[PDB]
Amino acid sequence: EVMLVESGGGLVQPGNSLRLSCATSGFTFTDYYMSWVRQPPGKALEWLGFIRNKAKGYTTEYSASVKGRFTISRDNSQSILYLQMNTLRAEDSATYYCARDISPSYGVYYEGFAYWGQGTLVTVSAATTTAPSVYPLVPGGSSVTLGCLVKGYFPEPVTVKWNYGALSSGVRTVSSVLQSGFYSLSSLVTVPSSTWPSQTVICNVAHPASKTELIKRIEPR
């Protein structure tokens, strides 16, 4: 099972530097070029650069936009990829992906990124890392709609789950909105009225940047 996992993301101050890592497993690391790809919120994918496999001498190439600013390296003993980011600006606020690139020297070779990490959001702002508050949404027939209103968190993102991911059906999560330097989103789930409150309904709001999880049990008025 091929795995690509990004880390190091979060809030970083303008002018500063950040190092990202990309743990891997499930394939012969040194057989593959590895690439980094970034994506500003609501924008297109942008290739940043790659590092080549062993056979090619692990040489690096970068895109015009990031030359002299971003740097790629690899720990071949631990199968970890790295992205060194210097002198960050707001324009660098994006989700950063690591992707397995080609292996032209051994085994199957084709031109494509077969596997990607889940990506890590980097946001460059002088502001303050503040975990969100999670408020319940409950009514004042056969179905009932509930949810959690998530306000005052920074930076992005937050993810919301229900019943620790067991309740996946009828979930709607609106996009975030930014106001007065803070984010908020609300997530709702519709269930059969025979399910609640007779049974338990909980949302799990996760805010990576503060390494925080809030659980909120949805109770009747």
Binding site: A44, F50, I102, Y110, G112, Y135, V138, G140, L185
Partner: protein
């Protein structure tokens, strides 16, 4: 190398055919390998990009017949024989002949039958009030098309300040939208009034859908 995609976005109904363009400033034909180094990726909302076509026309393990990649040189195309609910995504082309360059993307949306929203209203929570905050939330669920309007009325009077609006991505199963409208007051503004009304206006009707509650309940 410069990659240019087209159209930036389009909407078709389930079952319809679609064509997306991708153009590069230089040929992507590699004379040594004799293959075109262009790939198509699919990125669904909140998800990582996934490979569909590589070498211009070769479909990746798992991808259905419905997707076909054509073209050679500097002019390429992604075709979806018949679009389905799963296809909601931005589609990116990527040259890999000289390093790698992504196109700007094509967002694929689905046209579908108009549907009216189910509208709910939510009074503030005690724990938020406890902290001196009062968020009232009107939820509009599973409607189409996307444009929709909510008017807030407090004690019969229209309120416009302190209102935030947010949509979901088009749903991957029924292709609908939902949106929340939130009015945010201080615990003190809120306890100064009783009737809280949100009216939802949509093309599915002349008459707005109205949901209300009284703070004194």
């Amino acid at each position: 190398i410069v990659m240019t995609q087209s159209p930036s976005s389009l909407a078709v109904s389930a079952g319809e055919k679609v064509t997306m363009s991708c153009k590069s400033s230089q040929s992507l034909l590699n004379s040594r390998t004799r293959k075109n180094y262009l790939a198509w990726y699919q990125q669904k909302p909140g998800q990582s990009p996934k490979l569909l076509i590589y070498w211009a026309s070769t479909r990746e393990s798992g991808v259905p017949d419905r997707f076909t990649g054509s073209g050679s040189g500097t002019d390429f195309t992604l075709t979806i024989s018949s679009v389905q609910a799963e296809d909601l995504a931005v589609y990116y082309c990527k040259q890999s002949n000289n390093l790698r360059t992504f196109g700007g993307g094509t967002k694929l949306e689905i046209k579908r039958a108009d549907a009216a929203p189910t509208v709910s209203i939510f009074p503030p929570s005690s724990e938020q009030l406890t902290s001196g905050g009062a968020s009232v939330v009107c939820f509009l669920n599973n409607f189409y098309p996307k444009d929709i309007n909510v008017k807030w009325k407090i004690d019969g009077s229209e309120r416009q300040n302190g209102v935030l609006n947010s949509w979901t991505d088009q749903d991957s199963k029924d292709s609908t939208y939902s949106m929340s409208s939130t009015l945010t007051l201080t615990k003190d503004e809120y306890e100064r009034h009783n009737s809280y009304t949100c009216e939802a206006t949509h093309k599915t009707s002349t008459s707005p859908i109205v949901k209300s509650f009284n703070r004194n309940e």
